[PDB]
Ligand binder design. Structure first.
Ligand SMILES: OC[C@@H]1O[C@@H](O[C@@H]2[C@@H](O)[C@@H](O)OC[C@H]2O[C@@H]2OC[C@@H](O[C@@H]3OC[C@@H](O[C@@H]4OC[C@@H](O)[C@H](O)[C@H]4O)[C@H](O)[C@H]3O)[C@H](O)[C@H]2O)[C@H](O)[C@H]1O
Ligand SMILES: O[C@@H]1[C@@H](O)[C@@H](O)OC[C@@H]1O
Ligand SMILES: [Ca+2]
Ligand SMILES: [Ca+2]
Ligand SMILES: [Ca+2]
Length: 464
């Protein structure tokens, strides 16, 4: 069977991982007011490096159970199709209740009845996880405050959890689905909610969860959301991102990858959804490609295996001058993180098992330079620009004759043709500088050798 094995908490207790130990990563679809996305459209997520699908299954009715209100269960035939199609495609599925125009709200009786019907229905589907309710409170913790808008969401979480565990004893549960989860303060407020949940459900405020995690969204922004997640992780509670958007929020994704946290992004499986289509490059694949983000996919060969050389495998951050040694190009290999015309490293130095040609340099500071740079060659360096704006881009270069380079950032040309002066010698060094406008974020710096005949020691960036 291609059916995926039950997700489980990882050893580090940071998130749910799959049957191969890898995080869950995926886009979303909806059966709230539309049919289930076709099989071939769901299949496309496998080629975009994903192994999961977020389903907004049904939208709640605030008026329920008043006359003419829409009851839960209306989409059952469409949800069954999503469950079957994900089963057969070897994908994980996270099912939740959506809100339509009523995000930051819920109807407790509607939620209890929804889960009463659906929990037993998919209990045995080992690829299916249950997320209690999307964004049930405007707009994050503490739900347990008597003045939360609206009140009683923790009672709903408790009640639905018990319903789920009665009929689906082994099914992973994602709790809270906080819209705005930000700062040490946010984590502290979430811990009030968690402690109250745990006391009611486990009889002990400090329960060690075996099959539950905190669902959250990214609307506090990447930095504050990352702080809040790190706090919650330190407190011993796993989490799972279920909805965020920047297109892909590359910055938060990078942080979640570092922290070992699974994620579902708010771009949709075609034909339809309320945001942006995940198969259009401008909303996902190009953002991943341009940034240098990498993970090992469950299916296919994309994204490429690559990353930062040195610096603990983390993106080199700008401030203040930031130096990137030419010899510290990203790992990933020929045609991926660099292109060299011969697979031998002719200089033999520093990285003898990659193709870039590297020699000891006599330049100030010593170390190494890239040499034997031939027309068409290129080198990539994954960096992170905190502050958007104009920077001085400096190349430390040498050459007997003049040469031409062009430098891209996130696959956008920032320099045009850049004529590098002859210095009269391959170890006679000069600094060439050009102003560039850089956008904020994780991005690959690419040196493109338009001609050969120059050596490159290092690259510098500093604000003008
Ligand atoms: O279908 C998914 C939808 O997304 C969920 O909200 C997310 C939230 O989880 C997080 O990721 O932040 C972004 C939120 O997205 C906003 O969601 C609401 C949406 O506007 C509503 O769109 C639906 C409209 O109504 C339906 O239209 C079709 C019709 O046939 C039906 O009867 C209508 O009810 C509604 O009036 C809009 O306010 C924004 O466009 C989007 O950015 C939601 O919980 C889930 O429903
Ligand atoms: O540094 C240079 C190299 O770039 C090449 O062009 O000739 C050999 C020297 O070591
Ligand atoms: Ca070579
Ligand atoms: Ca070369
Ligand atoms: Ca160097």
């Amino acid at each position: 069977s291609p059916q995926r094995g039950r997700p489980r908490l990882n050893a580090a207790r940071t998130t749910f991982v799959g049957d191969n130990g890898q995080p869950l990563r995926g886009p979303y679809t909806s059966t709230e007011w539309t049919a289930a996305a076709p099989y071939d459209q769901i299949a496309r997520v496998k080629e975009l490096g994903f192994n999961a699908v977020h389903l907004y299954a049904e939208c709640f009715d605030p008026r329920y159970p008043a006359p003419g209100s829409k009851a839960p269960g209306y989409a059952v035939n469409e949800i069954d199709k999503i469950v079957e199609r994900t089963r057969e495609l070897g994908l994980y599925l996270v099912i939740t209740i959506g809100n339509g125009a009523n995000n930051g709200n819920h109807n407790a009786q509607w939620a209890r009845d929804f889960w009463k019907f659906y929990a037993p229905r998919y209990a045995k589907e080992t690829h299916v996880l249950y997320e209690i309710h999307n964004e049930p409170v405007a707009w994050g913790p503490p739900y347990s405050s008597s003045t939360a808008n609206p009140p009683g969401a923790v009672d709903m979480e408790i009640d639905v959890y018990r319903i789920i565990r009665t009929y689906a004893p082994e099914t992973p549960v994602l709790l809270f689905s906080y819209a705005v989860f930000g700062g040490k303060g946010g984590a502290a407020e979430a811990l009030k909610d968690i402690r109250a949940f745990n006391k009611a459900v486990f009889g002990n405020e400090n329960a060690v969860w075996t099959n539950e995690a905190v669902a959250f969204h990214g609307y506090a922004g990447w930095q504050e959301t990352t702080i809040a997640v790190e706090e919650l992780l330190k407190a011993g509670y796993p989490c799972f991102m279920t909805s965020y958007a920047g297109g892909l929020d590359v910055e938060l994704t990078y942080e979640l990858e570092r922290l070992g946290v699974s994620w579902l992004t708010f771009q949709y499986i075609p034909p339809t959804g309320v945001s942006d289509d995940v198969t259009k490059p401008e909303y996902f694949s190009a953002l991943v490609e341009n940034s240098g983000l990498s993970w090992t996919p469950d299916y296919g060969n994309w994204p490429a295996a690559r990353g930062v050389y040195g610096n603990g495998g983390l993106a080199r951050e700008t401030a203040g001058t930031t130096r990137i040694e030419a010899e510290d190009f990203d790992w990933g290999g020929n045609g991926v993180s660099y292109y060299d015309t011969d697979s031998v490293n002719v200089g033999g130095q520093y990285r003898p098992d990659e193709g870039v040609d590297i020699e000891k340099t006599s330049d100030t500071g010593g170390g190494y330079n890239v040499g034997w740079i031939s027309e068409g060659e290129w080198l990539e360096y994954t960096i992170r620009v905190r502050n958007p704006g104009y920077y001085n881009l400096s190349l430390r270069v040498a050459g007997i004759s003049g040469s031409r380079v062009q430098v891209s950032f996130g696959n956008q040309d920032k320099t045009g043709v850049w004529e590098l002066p002859a210095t009269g010698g391959f170890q006679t060094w000069t600094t060439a500088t050009r102003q560039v406008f850089l956008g904020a974020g994780l991005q690959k710096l690419r040196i493109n050798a338009l001609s050969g005949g120059f050596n490159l020691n290092w690259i510098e960036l500093s604000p003008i």
